[PDB]
Amino acid sequence: MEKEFEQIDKSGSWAAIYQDIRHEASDFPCRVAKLPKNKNRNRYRDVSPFDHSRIKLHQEDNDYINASLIKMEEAQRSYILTQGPLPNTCGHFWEMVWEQKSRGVVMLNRVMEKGSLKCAQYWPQKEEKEMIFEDTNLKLTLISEDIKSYYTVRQLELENLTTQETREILHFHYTTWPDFGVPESPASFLNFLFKVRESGSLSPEHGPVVVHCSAGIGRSGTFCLADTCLLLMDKRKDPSSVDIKKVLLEMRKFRMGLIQTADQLRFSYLAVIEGAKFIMGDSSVQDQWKELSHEDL
Numbered sequence: 697m698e699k700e701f702e703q704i705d706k707s708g709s710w711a712a713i714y715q716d717i718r719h720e721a722s723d724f725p726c727r728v729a730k731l732p733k734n735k736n737r738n739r740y741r742d743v744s745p746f747d748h749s750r751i752k753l754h755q756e757d758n759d760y761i762n763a764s765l766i767k768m769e770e771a772q773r774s775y776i777l778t779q780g781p782l783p784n785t786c787g788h789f790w791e792m793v794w795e796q797k798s799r800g801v802v803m804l805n806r807v808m809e810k811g812s813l814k815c816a817q818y819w820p821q822k823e824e825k826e827m828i829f830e831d832t833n834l835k836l837t838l839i840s841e842d843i844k845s846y847y848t849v850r851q852l853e854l855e856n857l858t859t860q861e862t863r864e865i866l867h868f869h870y871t872t873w874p875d876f877g878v879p880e881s882p883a884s885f886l887n888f889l890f891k892v893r894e895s896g897s898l899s900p901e902h903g904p905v906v907v908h909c910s911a912g913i914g915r916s917g918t919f920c921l922a923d924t925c926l927l928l929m930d931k932r933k934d935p936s937s938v939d940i941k942k943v944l945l946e947m948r949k950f951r952m953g954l955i956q957t958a959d960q961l962r963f964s965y966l967a968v969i970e971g972a973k974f975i976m977g978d979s980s981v982q983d984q985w986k987e988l989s990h991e992d993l
């Protein structure tokens with residue numbers, strides 16, 4: 697994998713490889729997303745879920761939410777990629793997390809980035825001010841949080857007011873991944889990823905983990921592409937067999953625009969190559985990543 701990486705660097709062809717992916721990427725209808733009554737449920741007019749893979753809310757009224765089920769068959773993992781909820785779709789977001797039985801939510805953006813709103817404040821920041829989503833009959837409470845230098849882990853209690861059943865939902869928030877950019881290093885990205893893996897949130901005993909950034913395609917796609925490729929290297933008999941471009945194209949059959957820049961693609965290569973070290977046995981790379989990620993700053 698590092699041989700191809702190496703030859704792409706030297707050829708200086710990241711942009712070309714990336715454009716080829718854009719050109720070969722699937723293109724399926726998004727009719728429900730584009731219905732006029734669904735307009736205020738989309739943060740960006742040009743980022744929509746494909747009809748075939750969209751997540752349907754269980755409410756009789758309007759079952760629409762800008763979310764997509766990305767089902768990677770060989771790797772055996774599923775993810776839900778969605779936009780940062782809007783003020784009117786926060787109830788919808790937690791309704792999907794409830795109905796889909798998700799256990800963890802991976803947020804890769806900040807509510808405000810460079811002076812622009814990118815996502816609504818859909819979870820409570822204070823223990824004492826829980827949130828109620830009237831339209832969906834759900835209550836959400838912040839139970840605790842572990843704040844690190846570049847990410848935070850939050851324990852949330854989601855409750856179905858109707859049945860009074862409650863669930864523990866884990867929030868994994870990467871606070872330093874710039875829009876249209878990349879993590880500070882493979883180390884802090886992988887550090888974050890394995891923290892999600894180790895929590896149990898990605899276990900097939902739970903519903904799909906819900907991943908999102910602002911549009912649910914650039915940073916979200918980068919996160920999922922690396923996790924899936926690492927899963928494959930640990931599955932197949934020959935880890936060097938993983939073709940990241942093919943995997944990216946497979947992912948794009950489920951949601952449009954996954955990976956938004958040639959550099960995010962190159963970063964994905966670095967994250968996987970680096971992460972392969974741990975998949976092959978190296979027992980010192982994980983701690984090395986933590987140190988390099990300066991999480992205890």
Ligand SMILES: O=C1C[C@@H](c2ccc(C[C@H](NS(=O)(=O)c3cccc(F)c3)c3nc(CCCc4ccccc4)c[nH]3)cc2)S(=O)(=O)N1
Binds near residue numbers: 742877914952953
């Ligand atoms: O790294 C990232 C990029 C963010 C991001 C990506 C895309 C958008 C959508 C945005 N729409 S508009 O209405 O502001 C907008 C801007 C320019 C032209 C236009 F008509 C509408 C956007 N779209 C493009 C270009 C198109 C990007 C794209 C490519 C394939 C599939 C889907 C979207 C660039 N920014 C917003 C944030 S993320 O939160 O997904 N993480």
